[PDB]
């Protein structure tokens, strides 16, 4: 009755596999929040998060919940009843931002486009100019539709218009370029279990003086005590204000998981994600499958494969897991039954996984009488791995 779990090959958009070097560190005996060993770990983790987010911000630190708690914590700390919040939505995660904003009493201005595509930044900028929102909140990369949004012009427009540009980089941080200072992002929130390959359940964040200034003004309480950044900043600085018992093991794992990213090198790691995305694409293509969505804003780290006429996609996903231990994602909501989503993130983004997922998917589709030519998919991925 000790735990017994299968070894999966995980090719969803998250949570993804964790590097063995992060796994092994989690068996390390704990130290307390106020132990000098712990404060040294905290401090180094903040420095690594500044390089990771490509920022000089004084404020780069983790919060103890999932990705969404991190997003909630930022938005809660900068929204007051009736502030205008502009939110451009092109996928499922844009609606989470609106749910959060509205819950904290914001007047929410939304824009929407066709799932599968992205906005012209110009349409967002014009709306910024028109409404003069306090906050523009946006998803960098929507795993629901597989698109990644250009953010630089939008950031520069928030800064000229004196808006705070708040970004959910949960699915992109550690996998796709995210440049907080260059794109004039005012606060960014990441997550651990996607491209960083750290166990789910912590949310690294960063924000600049413009965001901190607004937080310091809070005059009326931030509604969530646990998500109060004015007390979280006292935690993550010399005061060591006893706000909550930071998560010991999870901090050890984040520390290691970010060290590994920086060892790889950011640009090298980005280019490495694109390389495996290319091998996957060529296999899927040779297999006779089509990709969903606008190919010019394709998120590098998620691939959206169209489910063919007359095949049950749930049945394919379930056989893949039950027979091969291979996990990919369906869609629930507007794209339900239209696509599978194959993630290539973090430790899961490697040659052995890309090859196993194509072999797996080919075998399961031939079993469901998909019209494929057997053997083409793997040859096309191996061609990219050799070349």
Binding of residue 14 to its own copies (CB under 8 A) = yes
- Enumerate residues 6+ apart whose C-beta is below 8 A from 40: none
Binding of residue 299 to ligand PLP (CB under 6 A) = no
Nearer of residues 243 and 317 to ligand PLP, judged by Cβ: 243
Binding of residue 327 to ligand PLP (CB under 6 A) = no
Site pattern 280..309 for its own copies (x: CB under 8 A): ------------------------------
User: What residues numbered 89-128 form the site for its own copies, per CB under 8 A?
Assistant: 96, 99-100, 102-104
Structure tokens at 221: 């309480």
User: What residues numbered 47-66 form the site for its own copies, per CB under 8 A?
Assistant: 64-66
Binding of residue 67 to ligand PLP (CB under 6 A) = yes
Helix ranges restricted to H, the chain: 20-25, 36-52, 67-78, 92-103, 121-131, 152-160, 209-216, 229-235, 248-264, 266-286, 313-319, 351-367, 376-386
Binding of residue 171 to ligand PLP (CB under 6 A) = yes
Query: Is residue 53 within 8 Å of 170, Cβ to Cβ?
Result: no
**Distance, CA of 227 to CA of 72 (rounded, Å):** 7
Of 358, 372, 364, 360, the C-alpha closest to 312 is 364
CB under 5 to 8 A by kind: which of ligand PLP, its own copies, none does 142 bind?
A: ligand PLP
Binding of residue 139 to ligand PLP (CB under 6 A) = yes
Question: What separation in angstroms does the CA of 32 have from each of 42, 83, 227?
Answer: 12, 39, 21
Q: What are phi and psi of 372, to 5 degrees?
A: -120, 150
98, 107, 200, 224: which one contacts ligand PLP (CB under 6 A)? 200
- Which span sits near its own copies by CB under 8 A: 21-29, 83-91, 350-358, 370-378? 21-29
Q: What is the torsional sign of CA 95, 97, 100, 104?
A: negative
CB under 5 to 8 A by kind: which of ligand PLP, its own copies, none does 54 bind?
A: none
9, 12, 66, 348: which one contacts ligand PLP (CB under 6 A)? 66
Give the nearest distance from C-beta 200 to ligand PLP in angstroms.
5
- Enumerate residues 6+ apart whose C-beta is below 8 A from 367: 319
Query: Is residue 192 within 8 Å of 16, Cβ to Cβ?
Result: no
Nearer of residues 37 and 295 to its own copies, judged by Cβ: 37
Counted residue by residue, the chain has a size of: 387
Binding of residue 43 to its own copies (CB under 8 A) = no
Query: Is residue 303 within 8 Å of 281, Cβ to Cβ?
Result: yes
Give the nearest distance from C-beta 180 to its own copies in angstroms.
23
Binding of residue 14 to ligand PLP (CB under 6 A) = yes
Binding of residue 250 to its own copies (CB under 8 A) = yes
User: What residues numbered 321-350 form the site for its own copies, per CB under 8 A?
Assistant: 321, 327, 332
Q: Does residue 291 sit in helix, strand or coil?
A: strand
Q: Note the residues at the interface with ligand PLP (CB under 6 A).
A: 14, 66-68, 93, 139, 141-143, 168, 170-171, 191, 200, 244-245
């Amino acid at each position: 009755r000790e735990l017994c779990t299968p070894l999966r090959t995980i090719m969803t958009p998250g949570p993804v596999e964790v590097d063995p070097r992060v796994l092994r560190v989690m068996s390390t005996p704990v130290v307390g929040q106020f132990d000098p060993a712990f404060t040294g770990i905290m401090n180094e983790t903040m420095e690594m998060l500044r390089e990771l987010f490509q920022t000089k911000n004084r404020w780069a630190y983790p919060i103890d919940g999932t990705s969404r708690a991190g997003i909630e914590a930022v938005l809660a700390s900068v929204i007051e009843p009736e502030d205008d919040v502009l939110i451009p939505i092109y996928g499922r995660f844009g609606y989470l931002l609106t749910e959060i904003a509205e819950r904290y009493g914001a007047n929410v201005h939304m824009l929407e486009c066709e799932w599968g595509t992205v906005f012209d930044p110009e349409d967002i900028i014009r709306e910024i100019k028109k409404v003069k929102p306090k906050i523009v909140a946006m998803v960098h990369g929507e795993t629901s539709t597989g698109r990644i949004h250009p953010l630089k012009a939008i950031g520069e427009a928030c800064r000229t218009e004196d808006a705070l540009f708040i970004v959910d980089a949960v699915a992109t941080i550690g996998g796709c370029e995210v440049k907080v200072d260059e794109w004039k992002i005012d606060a960014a929130i990441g997550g651990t279990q996607k491209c960083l390959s750290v166990p789910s359940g912590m949310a690294p964040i960063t924000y600049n003086e413009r965001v901190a200034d607004v937080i310091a003004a809070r005059n009326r309480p931030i509604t969530s005590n646990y998500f109060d950044l004015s007390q979280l900043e006292d935690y993550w600085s010399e005061r060591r204000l006893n706000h909550h018992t930071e998560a010991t093991t999870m901090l050890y794992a984040l520390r290691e998981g970010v060290r590994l990213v920086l060892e790889e090198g950011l640009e090298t790691r980005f280019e490495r994600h694109r390389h495996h995305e290319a091998a996957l694409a060529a296999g899927i293509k040779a297999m006779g499958l089509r990709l969903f969505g606008d190919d010019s804003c394709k998120m590098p780290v998620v691939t959206c494969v169209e489910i063919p006429g007359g095949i049950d996609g749930e049945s394919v996903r379930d056989m893949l897991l039950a027979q091969f231990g291979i996990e990919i994602a369906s869609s629930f909501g507007p794209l339900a039954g239209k696509i599978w989503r194959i993630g290539t993130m973090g430790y899961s983004c490697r040659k052995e996984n890309v090859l196993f997922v194509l072999a797996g998917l080919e075998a399961v589709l031939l079993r469901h009488n998909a019209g494929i030519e057997a053997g083409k998919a793997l040859q096309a991925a191996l061609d990219v791995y050799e070349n």
